[PDB]
Design a protein around this ligand. Structure first.
Ligand code: BQZ
Ligand code: CA
Ligand code: CL
Ligand code: CL
Ligand code: CL
Ligand code: CL
Ligand code: CL
Ligand code: CL
Ligand code: CL
Length: 670
């Protein structure tokens, strides 16, 4: 019906900062060092005062040692604070039960995972193994169905309680496997680690995975952020409904933001909170990572999370009151670039590849995900019709969408699928539906949609909903100008097509509950890592499991009503996950891209590059760090390895020479 092509080449972006590519094992290693050191005030005011055990005792036998060769500026010195500004608000501290801490790096900093992938932007190979993190090493069996995972041994939580396999097993069994619990990020279902995957304890520092497929090495990426980040079981397990009289809601809400010094495996601990103002994190004295000189990390003693807006993060970073920003809203690009143009600017700004994409996602579940009424179900059936999706995508003037956010070389024509900024992208495999409004109007008439009341808007046939006008709800995040602008644009464009679209503008936490719960027709969404990197959370590319897809989930317990193209997509993703051949993998992502964009798994809105804004006083910030690839730049820059020269240090500490207090007390100890 439509004359498809490939998307036109965008204006050549000279992608600012260049990456110094290194091999995978240049960053870190696990080993015992002859001696260890820490800030002098800890030894003098805490150890010598009998307030804290000596350093060698608080550390594991073989801590994670950062190698100096990879450090952009070398070994650091202690002091200073990294100041962050966020548009999110904390729900509480129960990350594994799906509670958000406010985003913008806070949960990234608090929740350490089995593996780590965000610093992999600097490693050149599409067959790279994720970095060891809480899992120090792992071995595959000869058949490739068994994965033996060795954990960091002798490490402790920020409260001094031992970290071991029991924390890993409580997360797997009582957060992932438990159907009533949904960990933060919305992708921690058991099938995300493969359908039929089991995990068992061997001993206190050894776990064993059993997979149906042979060598599905891609699941090591799923073991990174956000899907495998264990919580303190000694604190969380007594609150869990299986071991208490608590409901699942009571367990999820057992640790509100006012609960202080929540145990973490991260570099800093939350010590202070003031509603709609600030969150203060203080150095974790039990942190299990050190530099080559034996200095216990982090170098920075404090971290601030100012509770403001996402736009204000860009404002404060160029002004110098904030130290970091991911410039990701095109409406803020010109104002930020003008301010960064000054040689006296306190921060540096660098654009990366086009890895920020937006998609229109349609709910594909006709089996009752989100318990829809007669109207909702009729929309599910329209969404599932290929001709309907072809009309919606063809009715979008993508050049006008791009220009509505920012004029210039930033935006690129984005039909949907894999981001043009990743190596796995193939332009020739991307199906582009050019702007054809008349063809789109004709396509809808061809499936029995016509204006029966004379208002120009199309009606359902007499048999469906009494022949009333078609009305579609559109779920949006109200925290961003970009999301709102795209939602408003979609309403106006669909009105030209004869479709009435109604905005459902919700805050981040309400938006997540409506999305993951299936209570939506359509939704405007910024892409996650699977479309910007392919290799990070590959299971989210298709409905490989009942809850792995963002737009096609099944309610527990009903089976997935997959359309043939979705099953073809699920087979390609499964093949790629278990593929050991680089040429085969590249080819599978070409097939995937073709199936996705021809059948319109989602509908692309726009794609553009983001910019990393970092305060100039910070040392060890890697050159060319993207804002978003394997994860957000807050993770990619390795914040525990950042330092400031003594003569350049700011005096921003709110709890100087203080350490975190006890969980549920009492603020910092002093
Ligand atoms: O976590 C680090 C990021 O936090 C923010 O994104 C959040 C926010 O959009 C939530 O509402 C979503 O639920 C979540 O998925 C998403 O990552 C920043 O915009 C981004 O630049 C980066 O700092
Ligand atoms: Ca009508
Ligand atoms: Cl080295
Ligand atoms: Cl909120
Ligand atoms: Cl708010
Ligand atoms: Cl319950
Ligand atoms: Cl607090
Ligand atoms: Cl708040
Ligand atoms: Cl970037």
């Amino acid at each position: 019906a439509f004359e498809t092509t490939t998307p036109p080449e965008p204006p050549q972006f000279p992608a600012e900062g260049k990456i110094n590519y290194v091999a995978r094992d240049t960053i870190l290693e696990f080993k015992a060092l002859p001696s260890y050191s820490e800030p002098d005030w800890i030894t003098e005011k805490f150890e010598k005062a009998g307030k804290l055990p000596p350093l060698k005792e608080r550390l594991p036998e073989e801590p994670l040692v950062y190698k100096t060769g990879n450090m952009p500026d070398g070994v650091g010195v202690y002091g200073d604070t990294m100041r962050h500004v966020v548009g999110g608000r904390p729900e509480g501290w129960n990350y594994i039960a799906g509670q958000s801490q406010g985003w913008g790096g806070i949960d990234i900093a608090l929740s350490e995972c089995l593996t780590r992938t965000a610093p992999l932007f600097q490693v050149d190979a599409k067959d790279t193994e994720p970095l060891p993190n809480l899992a120090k090493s792992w071995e595959w069996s000869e058949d490739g169905h068994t994965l033996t995972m060795h954990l960091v041994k002798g490490a402790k939580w920020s409260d001094g309680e031992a970290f071991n396999a029991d924390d890993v097993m409580f997360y797997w069994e009582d957060a992932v496997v438990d159907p009533n619990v949904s960990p933060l990020g919305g992708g921690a279902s058991p099938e995300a680690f493969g359908e039929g995957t089991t995990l068992k304890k061997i001993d206190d520092y050894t776990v064993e995975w059993t997979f149906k497929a042979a060598f599905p090495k891609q699941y090591l990426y799923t073991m990174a952020y956000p899907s495998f980040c264990p919580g303190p079981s000694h604190i969380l397990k007594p609150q869990h409904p299986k071991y208490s009289k608590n409901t699942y809601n009571q367990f999820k809400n057992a640790f509100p933001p006012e609960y202080m010094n929540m145990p973490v495996m991260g570099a800093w601990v939350p010590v202070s909170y003031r509603p709609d103002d600030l969150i203060v994190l203080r150095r974790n004295p039990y942190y299990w990572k050190v530099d080559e000189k034996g200095q216990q990390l982090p170098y920075l003693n404090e971290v601030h999370y100012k509770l403001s807006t996402w736009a204000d993060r860009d404002v404060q970073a160029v002004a110098g009151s904030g130290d970091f920003s991911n410039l990701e809203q095109p409406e803020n690009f010109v104002a930020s670039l003008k301010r960064a143009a000054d040689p006296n600017a306190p921060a540096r700004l660098a654009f990366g590849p086009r890895l920020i994409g937006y998609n229109l996602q349609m709910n594909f579940s006709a089996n009752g995900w989100g318990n829809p009424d007669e109207r909702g179900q009729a929309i599910r059936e329209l969404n599932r019709n290929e001709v309907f999706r072809q009309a919606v995508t063809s009715a979008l003037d993508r050049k006008a969408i791009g220009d509505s956010l920012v004029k210039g070389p930033f935006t690129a024509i984005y039909p949907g699928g894999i981001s043009s900024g990743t190596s796995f992208y193939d332009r020739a495999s991307t199906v582009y539906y050019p702007f054809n409004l008349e063809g789109a109007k004709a396509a809808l008439a061809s499936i029995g949609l016509k204006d029966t009341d004379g208002d120009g808007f199309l009606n359902f046939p007499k048999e469906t909903l009494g022949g009333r006008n078609v009305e579609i709800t559109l779920l949006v995040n109200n925290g961003y100008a970009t999301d709102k602008s795209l939602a408003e644009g979609l309403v106006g464009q669909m009105a030209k097509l004869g479709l009435r679209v109604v905005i459902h503008s919700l805050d981040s936490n309400q938006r997540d509950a409506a999305h993951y719960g299936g209570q939506f027709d359509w939704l405007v969404r910024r892409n996650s890592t699977e479309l910007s990197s392919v290799v990070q959370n590959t299971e989210q590319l298709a409905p490989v499991g009942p809850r792995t897809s963002w737009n096609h989930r099944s309610p527990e317990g009903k089976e997935l009503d997959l359309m043939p193209f979705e099953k073809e997509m699920a087979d390609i993703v499964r093949k790629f996950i278990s593929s050991q051949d680089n040429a085969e993998r590249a080819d599978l992502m070409k097939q995937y891209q073709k199936v996705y964009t021809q059948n319109l798994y989602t509908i692309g809105l726009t794609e553009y590059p983001g910019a990393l804004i970092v305060n100039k006083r910070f040392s060890n910030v890697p050159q060319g760090t993207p804002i978003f690839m394997f994860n957000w730049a807050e993770d990619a820059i390795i914040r525990e390895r950042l330092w400031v020269a003594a003569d350049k240090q700011g005096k921003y500490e709110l709890f100087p020479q203080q350490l975190p207090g006890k969980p549920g007390e009492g603020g910092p100890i002093n």
